[PDB]
Amino acid sequence: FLSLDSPTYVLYRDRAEWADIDPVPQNDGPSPVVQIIYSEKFRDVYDYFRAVLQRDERSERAFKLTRDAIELNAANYTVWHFRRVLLRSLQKDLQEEMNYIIAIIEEQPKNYQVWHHRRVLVEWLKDPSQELEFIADILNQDAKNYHAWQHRQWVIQEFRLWDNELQYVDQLLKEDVRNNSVWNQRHFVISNTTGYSDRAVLEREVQYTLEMIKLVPHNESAWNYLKGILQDRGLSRYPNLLNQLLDLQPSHSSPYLIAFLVDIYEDMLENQCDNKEDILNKALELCEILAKEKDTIRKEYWRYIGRSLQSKHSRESDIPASV
Amino acid sequence: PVWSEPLYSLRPEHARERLQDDSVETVTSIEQAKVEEKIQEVFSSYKFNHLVPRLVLQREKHFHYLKRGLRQLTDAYECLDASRPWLCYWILHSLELLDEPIPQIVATDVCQFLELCQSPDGGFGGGPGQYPHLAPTYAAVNALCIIGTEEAYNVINREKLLQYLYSLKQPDGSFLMHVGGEVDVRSAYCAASVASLTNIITPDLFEGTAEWIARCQNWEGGIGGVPGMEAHGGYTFCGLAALVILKKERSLNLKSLLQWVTSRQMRFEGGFQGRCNKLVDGCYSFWQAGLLPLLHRALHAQGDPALSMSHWMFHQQALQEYILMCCQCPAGGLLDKPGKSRDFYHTCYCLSGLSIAQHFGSGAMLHDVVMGVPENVLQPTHPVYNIGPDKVIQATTHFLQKPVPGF
Numbered sequence: 142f143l144s145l146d147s148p149t150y151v152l153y154r155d156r157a158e159w160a161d162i163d164p165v166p167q168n169d170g171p172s173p174v175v176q177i178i179y180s181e182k183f184r185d186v187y188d189y190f191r192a193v194l195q196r197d198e199r200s201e202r203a204f205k206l207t208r209d210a211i212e213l214n215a216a217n218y219t220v221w222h223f224r225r226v227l228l229r230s231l232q233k234d235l236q237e238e239m240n241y242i243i244a245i246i247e248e249q250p251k252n253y254q255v256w257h258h259r260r261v262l263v264e265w266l267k268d269p270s271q272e273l274e275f276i277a278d279i280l281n282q283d284a285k286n287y288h289a290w291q292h293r294q295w296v297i298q299e300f301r302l303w304d305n306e307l308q309y310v311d312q313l314l315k316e317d318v319r320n321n322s323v324w325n326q327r328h329f330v331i332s333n334t335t336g337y338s339d340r341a342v343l344e345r346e347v348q349y350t351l352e353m354i355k356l357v358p359h360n361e362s363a364w365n366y367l368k369g370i371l372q373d374r375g376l377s378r379y380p381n382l383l384n385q386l387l388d389l390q391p392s393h394s395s396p397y398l399i400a401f402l403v404d405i406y407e408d409m410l411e412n413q414c415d416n417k418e419d420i421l422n423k424a425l426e427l428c429e430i431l432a433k434e435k436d437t438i439r440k441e442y443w444r445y446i447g448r449s450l451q452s453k454h455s456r457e458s459d460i461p462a463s464v
Numbered sequence: 465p466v467w468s469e470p471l472y473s474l475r476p477e478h479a480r481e482r483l484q485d486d487s488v489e490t491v492t493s494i495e496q497a498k499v500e501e502k503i504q505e506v507f508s509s510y511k512f513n514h515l516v517p518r519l520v521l522q523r524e525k526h527f528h529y530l531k532r533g534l535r536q537l538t539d540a541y542e543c544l545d546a547s548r549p550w551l552c553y554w555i556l557h558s559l560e561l562l563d564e565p566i567p568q569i570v571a572t573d574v575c576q577f578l579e580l581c582q583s584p585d586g587g588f589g590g591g592p593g594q595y596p597h598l599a600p601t602y603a604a605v606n607a608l609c610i611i612g613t614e615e616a617y618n619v620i621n622r623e624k625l626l627q628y629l630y631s632l633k634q635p636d637g638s639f640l641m642h643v644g645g646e647v648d649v650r651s652a653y654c655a656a657s658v659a660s661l662t663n664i665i666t667p668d669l670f671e672g673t674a675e676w677i678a679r680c681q682n683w684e685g686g687i688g689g690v691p692g693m694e695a696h697g698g699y700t701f702c703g704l705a706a707l708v709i710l711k712k713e714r715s716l717n718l719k720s721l722l723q724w725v726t727s728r729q730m731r732f733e734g735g736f737q738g739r740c741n742k743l744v745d746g747c748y749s750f751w752q753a754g755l756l757p758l759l760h761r762a763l764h765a766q767g768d769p770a771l772s773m774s775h776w777m778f779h780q781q782a783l784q785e786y787i788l789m790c791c792q793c794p795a796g797g798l799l800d801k802p803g804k805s806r807d808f809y810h811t812c813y814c815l816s817g818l819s820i821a822q823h824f825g826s827g828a829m830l831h832d833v834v835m836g837v838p839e840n841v842l843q844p845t846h847p848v849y850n851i852g853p854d855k856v857i858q859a860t861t862h863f864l865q866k867p868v869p870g871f
């Protein structure tokens with residue numbers, strides 16, 4: 142009906158069809174704190190909202206009023222709750238409401254309430270058929286929107302819509318290989334479909350990641366994904382990894398490659414590798430390089446790591462004090 | 465030496481910390497480069513203006529901004545009309561950090577307003593007449609604890625609060641943020657925080673909650689909002705802090721968490737990003753850097769022998785430099801990054817993070833690092849609740865005089 146931004150918008154206190162209702166002023170007390178000096182339009186809508194809420198008036202006019210209250214403050218979760226009460230009480234068409242929430246999310250996508258509302262609608266309708274395309278449009282504008290990725294995971298998992306998501310992930314990694322949300326989505330998809338224990342899958346994923354590392358050696362996301370998919374089994378379980386990373390040292394180096402080396406060495410020492418001492422000193426040398434030159438922002442972390450490795454892996458570490 | 469620059473961000477080597485994009489441009493690298501150029505201008509402004517750098521926390525300006533906001537806000541704050549207890553908390557905490565006393569007149573007015581925000585069925589809403597919600601409930605309880613008077617403590621209906629928490633509890637261990645609302649790790653933290661402060665924790669209230677939080681830790685080492693989601697500083701703080709309250713930090717892989725958080729400090733800017741490959745933001749000075757004290761305490765309780773006894777495991781100096789040089793509005797208030805506007809939320813968390821960066825404490829051991837003028841030093845904050853540690857102790861002691869509702 143009358144859009145909040147319409148040139149001919151009129152205050153609720155001036156509307157004939159609201160004449161019967163006394164608006165309800167906010168009760169901030171005799172000496173207010175954090176008192177917001179609301180605009181006229183804002184205070185007018187919310188005075189009327191307080192009135193319909195207080196009376197629990199479940200009417201078409203109250204339903205339309207929630208649209209304005211939401212537009213004025215989409216984070217007002219009380220208004221959203223009442224709007225959902227009205228959707229059910231008035232038996233409103235839920236596909237019309239889906240059209241509404243898609244428009245609102247498009248304009249204010251960084252808001253918890255709007256995404257939760259959309260989830261409730263999808264649950265009520267048991268219809269996920271618009272979701273992936275809708276979310277894709279939001280991600281086309283902000284490829285890192287946290288709520289959008291979260292809703293996407295919920296939709297995929299709840300409705301088992303796994304079949305095309307790896308393809309979607311590959312598309313987004315092509316657009317921006319530094320997009321960490323997308324690396325996260327890659328792990329989410331693989332973990333819940335094939336899993337990473339399938340050797341062919343793990344192999345494919347490591348080769349792919351190494352290929353991205355070669356293309357963009359300072360991209361931290363690829364480095365974190367490589368570590369993430371290997372670390373629970375233990376980096377030292379993969380003896381070829383070390384040599385192959387050392388082979389990137391010359392013209393593909395980074396503080397990330399160096400840090401990964403330390404992580405490889407750390408696991409080796411934990412699993413009683415050959416040449417305990419040789420490995421230790423290699424690791425300590427690297428920790429020092431990182432702390433003093435290559436990654437000084439993390440000097441406290443790297444000194445802590447060097448200290449930890451020394452404390453438990455030095456030849457003297459298991460030697461009784463009397464010796 | 466005379467040629468030596470005492471500020472880490474102004475040293476000549478620091479230029480080597482600029483982004484290397486490997487000649488492959490994407491939206492991510494373009495955006496990072498834009499921030500770095502703006503920050504470099506800030507860093508170099510002294511040199512180009514031929515002045516000696518002096519890092520001063522603009523206390524009087526911040527106090528004026530806070531004192532007024534505690535009473536009245538412009539319509540710029542309409543979007544926070546359902547978060548008024550957060551405004552009370554952010555402002556009162558900032559004032560506490562700045563060691564500015566709270567007039568009893570103000571204290572009593574805050575108490576009375578929060579009473580009006582309290583629901584008959586327990587918890588606090590975003591404003592008077594609003595349904596209760598765990599976020600303003602957390603804020604309201606923190607604010608009342610910062611005030612710390614008998615009147616303030618008495619505002620909280622403890623019996624109804626517990627009932628409210630039970631009404632939000634889910635079978636999988638998680639909590640709804642509010643009735644008919646969303647679930648994420650924020651709710652676990654909000655619930656743990658208010659229940660522990662007010663001594664209403666029953667034997668089964670948090671059954672399954674530690675395990676649910678641990679499922680939110682992912683392949684990155686940090687914690688996402690729900691299981692499966694990308695690791696983020698805000699959710700990671702909520703997850704670890706709730707586990708500390710529950711005495712269940714060991715449920716997490718603390719080592720992968722430590723590696724993840726330390727990697728979130730930006731080598732050039734000195735501040736922290738909220739997740740991998742996104743931008744620095746002053747409020748993560750708290751959410752991210754606040755994890756380091758939590759991890760220190762946790763690792764120490766495990767008898768970790770290699771822990772520093774004077775510093776947190778992040779660059780305390782670089783963080784203070786970022787906050788002092790980049791995050792202050794000359795008119796008063798702090799902000800996200802240069803070019804953004806001041807707001808009470810960033811004022812709260814930038815100062816909270818500055819305090820953490822200034823103060824190391826591990827039992828008997830204490831060490832301060834105060835960059836810039838000595839008057840820059842803030843009051844310490846408790847890394848779990850983010851109110852003064854004195855206020856935490858005083859509140860917990862007071863409520864322990866009461867029995868857990870139901871006995």
Ligand SMILES: Cc1ccccc1S(=O)(=O)N(CCN(Cc1cncn1C)c1ccc(C#N)cc1)Cc1ccccc1
Pocket residue numbers: 547550698738745747800807808809810
């Ligand atoms: C944490 C909180 C507290 C009260 C109300 C809302 C929120 S929030 O969960 O919506 N939160 C804070 C929302 N936010 C936006 C934000 C914070 N940092 C960067 N941004 C864009 C705010 C900005 C200013 C104020 C004030 N006054 C209050 C919230 C989201 C968020 C946190 C960190 C980075 C980005 C987004």
Ligand SMILES: CC(C)=CCC/C(C)=C/CC/C(C)=C/COP(=O)(O)OP(=O)(O)O
Pocket residue numbers: 251285286287599602650653654696697698699702737738739742743745751
């Ligand atoms: C107790 C309590 C309520 C704590 C709040 C915890 C907190 C800070 C959560 C942040 C969640 C979130 C929506 C991040 C994305 O914002 P973004 O994409 O605009 O920011 P980004 O680029 O820095 O991830």
Ligand SMILES: [Zn+2]
Pocket residue numbers: 745746747748800810
């Ligand atoms: Zn912020």
